[PDB]
């Protein structure tokens, strides 16, 4: 649960994917589950979005963020198994 | 020169692109200039590689790196103007 | 010149790349020359940006644009030769 | 929601047709995709179309990729939808 | 081998809920490799002449297989994709 | 045929400002193909056993070659990259 890029169980059919805000300019941002991407909501120190998912399945998490005020970007991917953890 | 992702002047026709080592597992890594990619060498706290370049031109820097033992990765891009800066 | 995706000569070493506005939500947009990308400025009915270039070379133009208010995107590419054309 | 040129039809509760109205590209090749699973589109009744397995009520990324300018260009269009019973 | 097993880029049935995706070794330097199912990618294990990994899957569904491999001794790569329907074939 | 000309994915010197990039046919369905130099891509022409296209280049400069090809009869593709230095070799 200390990882900046992580997820919360919301229900057996819903996963919240998040990335803690590390200070990027973030003119735009997308949070994605298996490359299905939506704009992240910045709340309580993290960019977050909820998706439909199936407990016990494996997923690719992606965070894509605008950086350097027009001059860059970062894309971060991590694989997870969707469990009942609640971290943030 | 405090920026973790940056470049050093090598000569009028060469640029070193680097990213300070942030602790990724880094089973592979690539440093790129305008999407021409080579494996980075880890030296003095950073992943680094040298490319042909032209002083004064603009370039896209990329750093791509394995993390989480191959369960993840990070790709970082930034645009720079190649100057005589040495960090 | 009547093509919505095109360029203007600025100097022997400068090209303006533009895409006429086709109505996208366009929360973000990038104009690119050989995958070197910058945010486009929307002016006079087109998204535009100026880049260093070399008269007579061939370039890939790219226009990347946010669409559908968070729910989509479009990426358009075209190859050109940089000439003295002004549209 | 049937006006959009980039859209889908219900085929059955387990099958979705994804399509893009033909806008005149050279289209030496084209792909229609569902969640980045891609197949060559068939041009039929003014649109490039293909059918895929899907689950009613799930969210999907639609993609249309097409050649233009005789191989001197291309376009890739993405949009997110929820799979419903609409037939357009 | 039967026709559906000839191909160097292929899959084995493991169970009704598990698929093994593999690519026979073709000689790449292969400092790194990934095997993927619907763009969920894992580092491949090389065993008995092929790079391989097992995934969750549903018999009868369609999947994109991908194999990504390092090539040219630091100077390149190859990425291969092919679509399959997950069946009970067992090949390698 | 010397070492630098052996590989199926390679280049020919055409003149001091032109490089031909090619990939020898390896059997793909190949409904479409692209040959690229530094990610500037053109449809390849198939002639004499290889997919090939010419580009502007400068002797002694380093380039990324890419070959992209349709495969599996509508069901896949392959993308190959390699880095080279442009020299006066003539191979195919």
UniProtKB/Swiss-Prot annotation, chain A:
Belongs to the glycosyl hydrolase 26 family. Induction: By beta-1,3-xylan. Residues 1-88 are annotated as: Carbohydrate binding module (CBM). It comes from Alcaligenes sp. This is Beta-1,3-xylanase. Catalyzes the hydrolysis of beta-1,3-xylan into oligosaccharides, mainly xylotriose and xylobiose with smaller amounts of xylotetraose, xylose, xylopentaose and xylohexaose. Does not hydrolyze xylobiose, p-nitrophenyl-beta-xyloside, beta-1,4-xylan, carboxymethylcellulose, curdlan, glucomannan or beta-1,4-mannan. The carbohydrate binding module (CBM) binds to insoluble beta-1,3-xylan, but not to insoluble beta-1,4-xylan, beta-1,4-glucan, beta-1,4-mannan, curdlan, chitin, or soluble polysaccharides. It comes from the Bacteria. Disulfide bonds join 1-87, 32-37.
């Amino acid at each position: 649960c200390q990882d900046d890029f992580n997820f919360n169980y919301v229900s057996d059919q819903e996963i919240e994917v998040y990335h803690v805000d590390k200070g990027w300019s973030a003119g735009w941002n997308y949070v994605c589950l298996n490359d299905y991407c939506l704009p992240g909501n910045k709340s309580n120190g993290a960019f977050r979005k909820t998706f439909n998912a199936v407990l016990g399945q494996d997923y690719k998490l992606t965070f894509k963020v605008e950086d350097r005020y027009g001059q860059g970007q970062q894309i971060l991917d991590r694989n997870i198994t969707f469990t009942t953890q609640v971290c943030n």
